Nucleic acid binder design. Structure first.
Length: 139
DNA sequence: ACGGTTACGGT
């Protein structure tokens, strides 16, 4: 395998990437992240800066992807991965939601068939240098 | 059934 920029991923494949967590949302069914590497993808939602009432502060346009975490991925991350953290996600599955937007999914995988994972990366890892420099262009 | 639909809500 190898890592891809969010700009390079497409629907219905397995992929790995480094990203920054912008937004998290827990429910009693799953844990959801919205992550960016500050590269654009035409299948991402165009986040608006004009919204009345939003805690989103960017990036705006098509720069972030929703990640739905199920089961062990959910339970592990829900009280651990926080907005602003950096993460590395490996071998996750992509699909398209009902409105045609790219989206990434971590199903429960007890049989350990897929080797999926998500861990925090220390804010200072040099693997984050690109995300950090690109971010400079949008702030 | 292996699920949750919409870019907020801020649980």
């Amino acid at each position: 395998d190898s890592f891809s920029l969010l700009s390079q991923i497409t629907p219905h494949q397995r992929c790995s990437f480094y990203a920054q967590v912008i937004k998290t949302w827990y429910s009693d069914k799953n844990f959801t992240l919205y992550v960016t590497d500050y590269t654009e993808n035409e299948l991402f939602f165009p986040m608006s800066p004009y919204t009345s009432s939003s805690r989103w502060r960017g990036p705006f346009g098509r720069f972030s992807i929703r990640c739905i975490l199920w089961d062990e991925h959910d339970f592990y991350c829900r009280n651990y991965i926080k907005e602003g953290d950096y993460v590395v996600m490996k071998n996750v599955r992509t699909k398209i939601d009902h409105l045609g937007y790219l989206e990434c999914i971590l199903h429960g995988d007890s049989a350990k068939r897929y080797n999926m994972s998500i861990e925090k990366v220390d804010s200072e890892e040099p693997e984050l240098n690109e995300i950090k420099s690109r971010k400079r262009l949008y702030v």
